[PDB]
Design a protein around this nucleic acid. Structure first.
Ligand SMILES: CCCCCC(=O)CC(=O)N[C@H]1CCOC1=O
Ligand SMILES: CCCCCC(=O)CC(=O)N[C@H]1CCOC1=O
Lengths: 225, 233
DNA sequence: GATGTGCAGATCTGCACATC
DNA sequence: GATGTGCAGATCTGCACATC
């Protein structure tokens, strides 16, 4: 199947509100074995988030102003380049406080991750993180920093631009719109043929159409894609 | 200082496209370039947003230079910022490429900086700053990572907010193709189209597959999508 | 209800050929 | 070239039923 960066690039192109996007982001994170994801926009010390991290951890994170303690945000602020982090692996040279921070985050299964930080308008920044409950992130192939940046640039803009087709309906329909067969969609998305078949036939039924070409035309005409 | 930063700031302003294109043109000028060019590529089907001379835009597509331009070739091959130069590449270039670059020079396009990225559904987009200088003499190399981050945002601003192409490759449908394709777009089968338009099933079959051949698409859904996207229906 | 499984028959797509 | 013929195999659509 395609990489999650490609999945994110595809998602950045679908229509819909924040709710639709979050459903899609969570599914991608889950699909690739991550416990959650988090998008953060940071201007100075002011942060806004689009994440599926436990609400309890989010509240604590905001309440105790962890943006100023989180080693991940520190690195992101320091260098705009994708990186992997690990609470366990980073232990040495981590203040007693940064240590307490990681132990608390561990209670939520946030122990390691991959983060992609980029510069955005007005000298501010945005970062996207894929979190794991594993001790460390082990990768056979290093992720292309350039491709990672291009992907997050699109994801950031899409979020900044914030009935509808759901993420799977939209994502699958978009591939139908570029000539893919359902088997090919199953392969690139890493899902079962039947999941693609079921999702799309339901879309067809809800819109009362008899062919993919009709669903495609109606979706485009109605700005659903 | 740093046009990449200016582009990032511009990618954030939401308003009508007329202001976006003006902003892009202004940045290109401010930093000493002859102009800019954004291309969204979907296998030979290309849409452009650029302030390159209107005549060059017309020639570029009428001659299908996308298939000749070494800049596009390199972009399709590797998604990484690069600088190009007609004069510097001379030795490497064939007779058609040299000529190609010659015509471009007539429009103030002799060298440039191009940033290509991958976009949704296996396609790509690229942003170029063109100069009239024989070569780009950069004092400091432009960070490929930062460049990608910027163009990812510019691509989303142009594409997601549905900007009007300033130029694109020629794609059309003759009267019959259009008539039959409109029916396909509302759920009809080839047979049903034959009955309603009072023609042979083979007439509909051949008219549409030839159109599919011309657009280079594998399915009717794809032909339908490109046709609607291009306003042919 | 949300999804998934199966498949018969409907349709289309890819290829080789033929005719206007 | 534009249009038309022929068809095996690819691919989809509609309906019935299964899972949990
Ligand atoms: C609003 C919720 C906080 C999101 C924080 C973020 O983006 C970066 C990050 O994953 N930091 C990790 C590392 C240890 O705990 C975390 O949460
Ligand atoms: C529609 C106008 C064509 C834009 C093509 C483009 O984006 C890349 C590019 O700069 N190619 C250059 C190099 C020689 O001529 C050009 O135009």
């Amino acid at each position: 199947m395609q990489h999650w960066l490609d999945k994110l690039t595809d998602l950045a192109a679908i229509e819909g509100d924040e709710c639709i996007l979050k459903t899609g982001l969570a599914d991608i994170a889950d699909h690739f074995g991550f416990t959650g994801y988090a998008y953060l926009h940071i201007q100075h010390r002011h942060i806004t988030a689009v994440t599926n991290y436990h609400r309890q951890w989010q509240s604590t994170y905001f309440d105790k102003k962890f943006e100023a303690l989180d080693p991940v945000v520190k690195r992101a602020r320091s260098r705009k380049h994708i990186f992997t982090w690990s609470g366990e692996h980073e232990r040495p040279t981590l203040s007693k406080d940064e240590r307490a921070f990681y132990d608390h985050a561990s209670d939520f299964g946030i122990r390691s991750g991959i983060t992609i930080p980029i510069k955005t308008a007005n000298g501010f920044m945005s970062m996207f993180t894929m979190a794991s409950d594993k001790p460390v992130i082990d990768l056979d192939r290093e992720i292309d920093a350039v491709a990672a940046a291009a992907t997050i640039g699109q994801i950031h803009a899409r979020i900044s631009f914030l009935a509808w087709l759901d993420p799977k309906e939209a994502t699958y329909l978009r591939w139908i719109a570029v000539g893919k067969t359902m088997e090919e969609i199953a392969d690139v998305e890493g899902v079962k043929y039947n999941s693609v078949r079921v999702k799309l036939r339901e879309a067809m039924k809800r819109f009362d159409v008899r062919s993919k070409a009709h669903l495609t035309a109606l979706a485009i005409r109605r700005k659903l894609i």
